[PDB]
Amino acid sequence: TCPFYKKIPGTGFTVDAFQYGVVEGCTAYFLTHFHSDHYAGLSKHFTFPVYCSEITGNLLKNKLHVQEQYIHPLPLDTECIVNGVKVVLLDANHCPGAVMILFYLPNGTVILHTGDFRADPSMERSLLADQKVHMLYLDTTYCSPEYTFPSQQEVIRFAINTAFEAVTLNPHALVVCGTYSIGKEKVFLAIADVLGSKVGMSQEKYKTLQCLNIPEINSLITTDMCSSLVHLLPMMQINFKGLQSHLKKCGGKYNQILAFRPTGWTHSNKFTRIADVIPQTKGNISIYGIPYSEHSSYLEMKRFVQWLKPQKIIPTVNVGTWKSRSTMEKYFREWKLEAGY
């Protein structure tokens, strides 16, 4: 049964609520982004209307084989009417096709559902600027002060320089990058670009990346592993056994692997600067964990909320414990008092 925080009151709408069968009174199902925790339950047998972005629509049709007639893509930054309710989709600065959703309720309430997001000051000059928000359904993944990490730009810089150094020292080194879902594509795209290679991957991943409207994509990726010196593998295989095995497959083309695991946050952020990061090494294999996040830091989250000044905040992540709920309400109150709303 559907939790209250996936219901938009005063409408027939839910958000990211596909794992509860037929939700009583829901006449349209919104999907914020193609991550499995959020799409859990969708398949080709789904017969209610789904509303999402164009990219999310591509993946529904091609990967989950949902039927065309039930997929309703909407343009971003465009006031649209759905079952008599004005809505807007906004870029969530998360993974490709990921959106925030504004609901303008009949009674005059305004609701923002962030989906998954990484807050940015650029959001302060969207169609959010023009009016008040009464309720915020907030991605609270890292709502605690200890969750710090760098900008995406600094991390990519670290990765690019690391990889270019290693391959210029050893032309026979291979670079590997782990993956298990969409998002974080810049990590492998940037590395392949500075090395002047295409990124090589399995057919199922190539199919997925083909759904994402990246410009010039056919120039950047390929299924021919033999022609590329940047390979993507499942995240699970990014370890000393998985990598030794894969090196064997390359038939003595390469004598060294440099691999990258893009995590979210790790406790090595409480002490170490991005510049200071070092690999785990075994023989001719090195592994870097790099903190490339597609969720708000604590400070980025605080800044957005303090800018938005909502009247009520409803968390969508870390809701399952009392300790977590309690902690989050404290920070909300602090933020409210500090900025005076």
User: Which residues sit at the interface with Ni ion, rule CB under 5 A?
Assistant: 35, 116
Identify which of residues 76 and 194 has a Cβ nearer to Ni ion in the complex: 76
d(CA 100, CA 123): 11
Identify which of residues 90 and 230 has a Cβ nearer to Ni ion in the complex: 90
Neighbouring-strand partners of residue 86: 81, 104
Which residues have CB under 8 Å from 24's CB, separation 6+?
A: none
Neighbouring-strand partners of residue 82: 85
Provide, rounded to whole angstroms, the least separation between the CB of residue 180 and Ni ion: 12
Sheet of strand 71-74, all strands in order from the earlier edge strand to the far edge: 7-8, 13-15, 28-30, 50-53, 71-74
Provide, rounded to whole angstroms, the least separation between the CB of residue 31 and Ni ion: 11
Provide, rounded to whole angstroms, the least separation between the CB of residue 81 and Ni ion: 27
Provide, rounded to whole angstroms, the least separation between the CB of residue 95 and Ni ion: 6
Provide, rounded to whole angstroms, the least separation between the CB of residue 315 and Ni ion: 15
Identify which of residues 243 and 294 has a Cβ nearer to Ni ion in the complex: 294
Identify which of residues 40 and 80 has a Cβ nearer to Ni ion in the complex: 40
Q: Which two tokens stand for residue 337?
A: 């008092």
Provide, rounded to whole angstroms, the least separation between the CB of residue 5 and Ni ion: 16
CA distances (Å), 85 to each of 14, 77, 78, in order? Answer: 13, 16, 13
Reported in sequence order, the residue ranges of the chain that DSSP labels E, i.e. its strands, are 7-8, 13-15, 28-30, 50-53, 71-74, 80-82, 85-91, 99-104, 110-113, 135-138, 173-179, 199-200, 221-222, 230-234, 256-263, 280-282, 285-291, 312-315
Identify which of residues 116 and 300 has a Cβ nearer to Ni ion in the complex: 116
Burial 217-239 (b: 16+ CB within 10 A, else e): eeebbbeebeebbbbbbebeebb
Provide, rounded to whole angstroms, the least separation between the CB of residue 99 and Ni ion: 11
CA distances (Å), 266 to each of 261, 289, 291, 292, 300, in order? Answer: 12, 9, 7, 11, 18
